[PDB]
Design a protein around this ligand. Structure first.
Ligand SMILES: OC[C@H]1O[C@@H](O[C@@H]2[C@@H](O)[C@H](O[C@@H]3[C@@H](O)[C@H](O[C@@H]4[C@@H](O)[C@H](O)O[C@H](CO)[C@H]4O)O[C@H](CO)[C@H]3O)O[C@H](CO)[C@H]2O)[C@H](O)[C@@H](O)[C@@H]1O
Ligand SMILES: OC[C@H]1O[C@@H](O)[C@H](O)[C@@H](O)[C@@H]1O
Length: 549
C-alpha cells in the first residue's frame, strides 16, 4: 500500500550554483535557528554539485548541511561552513544538534571554524586549509566528532576539552586539553597520553561510513558505503568507494503526519526509510525487522514516543543502518527508548553488522521527559558510531525526579564496537557493559549535576554509580581514551567513588582513563574501581590512569 519516493518536503532546502541569493536564504534559516535550542523547527540544507562562491553558511540548531555529489569535492564552497558561539557569549558548550557532510571547503581566510560541542558530526568533508574547533575568543567547548574527512592544513582544537577523529587525514594537529583520541587518522599526533593527552590507534577495528543522499544526474539516490576492517584514512581519497546506490523510490519518504503503523508497513513491504526534517510522535515502536534496511534522517529528524512506548526496535537481522535521528523522550516514562535486537539474541552479525550512527537521545530539556534505559544493545557485532545519549541538565522539564533517567546505554551483545561514545547525566549507570569482547574507542561522560545528596546516589557499598561499568562476569573488554567529569552543583559536598568500574582480569583492559571535577563541584575518590588518585582543588586538573589493570 505504501508508495516509495516522492518530494522531500518544505524543510529540505535544495540549492544549485544558480539559485538566487543563496547567502540570504541560508542566513534566514540561521536567524531562526541560531538560539533555537529546544524548538521544533528542523532544516536540511542540500547543495547540488558545482562551485559556490562568496558563501558563509552559518549553522544553527537542528540544521544539517550537505553536498549532493558522490564525492566531497563534487560540491565545493569558496567560503565556509561555520559554527561559532556568538549567541551564548563565546561559550560553545550548548552548540548541539547540527551536522555537515560531503562538502569541500576553501575557507575565505584559510581556516574554517566548526566550534561545536556534542551531537555535531563533521563527516566526509574536505577542508582545503585549516580547521578551528574553538569559538572566537577561546571560550568553553565540549566536542566532538570528525570522520572520513580530509583536512589539508592543521586542526586546531585550542580550548576543546576532548575530541574523537577516525579514518581521516589531517595536515597537522595543534594541541590537546583532556582527551584527544584518534583511530585510523593519517597525520594524527603519536600516542603520548597523558602529555599531551593523545590516544592514538593506527586503525579502526571496523567502521562503515554513514549512508547519505546524493544526485546521480537528476536522480536522487542514497549511497550505502561498504564496511572497512582495520580502517585508516578516508574512504573516498582514491576514487570509487565501494558500496551500493539505492534509488529514492526504494525509500518510504517519511513526512510529519506519518504513523508508526504506516512506517512499519513500509519496512514490511521492503522499503527503506527516509525521515524528512521534522518531529514525529509515535504511539507504538517503529520496528525494523528486515535485513539491510536503511533508516536515514535529515535535518535532525526527531522521534518522540508517546504513552511510554519504545521509539525504535531493530529485530535480530543483519545490516540495518540507522543514521541521523534524534530520539526525544516523552513525559510518560518509557521502559526503553531504543532497542537493538531482542533480549537474549545470540546470533552473530559479523560480516554485515547493524549500526547506529549519529543517533542521539534526549531526556527532558524541551519539556519533561523520562525513560528508564535509553539504548539497549542486544545484537552481537553491532557498531555504535557516534551517539550522544543525554539526560538534560538544562532547559524546561529538568530535575532529579522531573526528568529522571536511570540508565543511559546497556550493551548486552558480544563483539559490540562503540566509536565516539558520548553519554551524560543519568541518575545511575550512564553505561553498563554486560556482553563479551566489547570495545570502546573514545568515551565522554559527565555525571548527573542534580544529585541532591550522597544517599541519593548510594550504589550498595559504592558512593555513586560508575559512568562506565563492565559487569564482573565479563572476561574480555577493551576501552581507549575515556573520561568522566563531575559537576555536582546542587550539592558540591558529594563524592563520586570512580568514573569506571570493571573486574580485574587479563582480558579486561583500559587505556588512557581520566576523571575531572569541574571547578571543585564534588570530587572523585578514584579513577577506576579504587585505583587512581582522587580529584582535588577547584582548578579542574584531571586525575589519570594510563593502563589498567
Ligand atoms: O552547558 C551545558 C553543558 O555543559 C557541559 O559541560 C560543561 C563543561 O563543558 C564545562 O567545562 C569547563 C571546561 O570546558 C573548561 O576547560 C578549560 C579550557 O576552556 C581551557 O582552554 O583550558 C583549561 C585547561 O588548561 C580547561 O580547564 O574548564 C572549566 C573550569 O575552568 C570547566 O568548567 O563546565 C561546565 C560547568 O561549569 C559544564 O556544564 C556538558 O557536557 C553538557 O552535557 C551540558 O549540556
Ligand atoms: O566571514 C568569514 C568568517 O565568518 C565567521 C567565521 O567565524 C570565520 O571562520 C570566517 O572566516
Amino acid at each position: 500500500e505504501v508508495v516509495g519516493g516522492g518530494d522531500l518536503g518544505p524543510n529540505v532546502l535544495v540549492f544549485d550554483p544558480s539559485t538566487p541569493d543563496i547567502q540570504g536564504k541560508v542566513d534566514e534559516v540561521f536567524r531562526k535557528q541560531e538560539s533555537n535550542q529546544f524548538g521544533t523547527d528542523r532544516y536540511a540544507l542540500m547543495f547540488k554539485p558545482g562551485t559556490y562562491n562568496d558563501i558563509n553558511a552559518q549553522i544553527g540548531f537542528y540544521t544539517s548541511i550537505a553536498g549532493l555529489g558522490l564525492n566531497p569535492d563534487d560540491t565545493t564552497f569558496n567560503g565556509d561552513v561555520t559554527v561559532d558561539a556568538g549567541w551564548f557569549d563565546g561559550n560553545a558548550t550548548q552548540n548541539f544538534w547540527r551536522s555537515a557532510e560531503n562538502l569541500a571547503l576553501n575557507p575565505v581566510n584559510g581556516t574554517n571554524r566548526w566550534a561545536v560541542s556534542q551531537a555535531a558530526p563533521f563527516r566526509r568533508m574536505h577542508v582545503k586549509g585549516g580547521l578551528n574547533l574553538a569559538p572566537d575568543g577561546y571560550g568553553w567547548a565540549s566536542g566532538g566528532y570528525i570522520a572520513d574527512s580530509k583536512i589539508d592544513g592543521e586542526v586546531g582544537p585550542y580550548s576543546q576539552q576532548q575530541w574523537y577523529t577516525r579514518d581521516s587525514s589531517v595536515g597537522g594537529w595543534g594541541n590537546g586539553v583532556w582527551n584527544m583520541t584518534f583511530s585510523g587518522v593519517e597525520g594524527a599526533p603519536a600516542q603520548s597520553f597523558p602529555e599531551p593527552p593523545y590516544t592514538t590507534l593506527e586503525t579502526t577495528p571496523v567502521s562503515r561510513e554513514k549512508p547519505f543522499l546524493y544526485l546521480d544526474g537528476d536522480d536522487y539516490k542514497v549511497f550505502v558505503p561498504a564496511k572497512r576492517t582495520n580502517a585508516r584514512g578516508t574512504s573516498w581519497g582514491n576514487g570509487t568507494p565501494e558500496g551500493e546506490s539505492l534509488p529514492l523510490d526504494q525509500f518510504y519518504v517519511v513526512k510529519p503526519g506519518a504513523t508508526a503503523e504506516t512506517i512499519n508497513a513500509a519496512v514490511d513491504q521492503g522499503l527503506h526509510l527516509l525521515f524528512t526534517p521534522g518531529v514525529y510522535h509515535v504511539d507504538q515502536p517503529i520496528e525494523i525487522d528486515r535485513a539491510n534496511t536503511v533508516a536515514l534522517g535529515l535535518g535532525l529528524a526527531t522521534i518522540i514516543p508517546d504513552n511510554g512506548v519504545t521509539a525504535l526496535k531493530v529485530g535480530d537481522v543483519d545490516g540495518v543502518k540507522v543514521a541521523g535521528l534524534l530520539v526525544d523522550a516523552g513525559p510518560v516514562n518509557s521502559e526503553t527508548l531504543v532497542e537493538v535486537g531482542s533480549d537474549g539474541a545470540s546470533g552473530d552479525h559479523a560480516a554485515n553488522p547493524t549500526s547506529l550512527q549519529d543517533v542521539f537521545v534526549r531526556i527532558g530539556g524541551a519539556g519533561p521527559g523520562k525513560a528508564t534505559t535509553s539504548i539497549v544493545v542486544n545484537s552481537n557485532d553491532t557498531i555504535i558510531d557516534h551517539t550522544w545519549v543525554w539526560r538534560a541538565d538544562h532547559g524546561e522539564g529538568v530535575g532529579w525526579e522531573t526528568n529522571r533517567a536511570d540508565y543511559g546505554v546497556h550493551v548486552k551483545g558480544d563483539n559490540v564496537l562503540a566509536t565516539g561514545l558520548f553519554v551524560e547525566h543519568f541518575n545511575k549507570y550512564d553505561v553498563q557493559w554486560s556482553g563479551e569482547n566489547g570495545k570502546t574507542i573514545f568515551y565522554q561522560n559527565a555525571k548527573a549535576y542534580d544529585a541532591p545528596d550522597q544517599a541519593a546516589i548510594q550504589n550498595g557499598d559504592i558512593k555513586g554509580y560508575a559512568a562506565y561499568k563492565v559487569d564482573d562476569s565479563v572476561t574480555t573488554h577493551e576501552g581507549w581514551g575515556m573520561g568522566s567529569y563531575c559537576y555536582f552543583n546542587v550539592n558540591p559536598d558529594i563524592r563520586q567513588q570512580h568514573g569506571f568500574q570493571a573486574p580485574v582480569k587479563p582480558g579486561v583492559k583500559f587505556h588512557d582513563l581520566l576523571v575531572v571535577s569541574l571547578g571543585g563541584k564534588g570530587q572523585y575518590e578514584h579513577v577506576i574501581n579504587d585505583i587512581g588518585d582522587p580529584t582535588s582543588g577547584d582548578t579542574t586538573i584531571p586525575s589519570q590512569v594510563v593502563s589498567f589493570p
